Design a protein around this ligand. Structure first.
Ligand SMILES: *[C@@H]1O[C@H](CO)[C@@H](O)[C@H](O)[C@H]1NC(C)=O
Lengths: 50, 46
């Protein structure tokens, strides 16, 4: 699962059966890490017009 | 895929099934590929 974004701590209690979450759009909002099993929040990197 | 969902909840109505809502989450998923057509439960003989 690839993407770009800021990974921060989160307080969304994933239940034991879900591994990754998706937006209203078909893209990841947060993910569970392998090896250490933790929940990383994904917030899109800043962008904008010039 | 044989998907198993389950939930334990208190109940207080023996005439029918108590009113309310609860969704059951998956626990086990076995890729057996067996044509399953019937099932039965097992009770402890006493
Ligand atoms: C990967 O390594 C970490 C480091 O201790 C360990 O806790 C974890 O259990 C390992 N992964 C699995 C799937 O066991």
């Amino acid at each position: 699962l690839t993407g770009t974004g800021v990974l921060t701590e989160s307080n969304k209690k994933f239940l034991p059966f879900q591994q990754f979450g998706r937006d209203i759009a078909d893209t990841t909002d947060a993910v569970r890490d392998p090896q250490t099993l933790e929940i990383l929040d994904i917030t899109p990197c800043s962008f904008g017009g010039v | 895929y044989f998907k198993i969902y389950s939930k334990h909840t208190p109940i207080n109505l023996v005439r029918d099934l108590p009113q309310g809502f609860s969704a059951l989450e998956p626990l086990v998923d076995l890729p057996i590929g067996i044509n399953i057509t019937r099932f039965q439960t097992l009770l402890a003989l006493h």
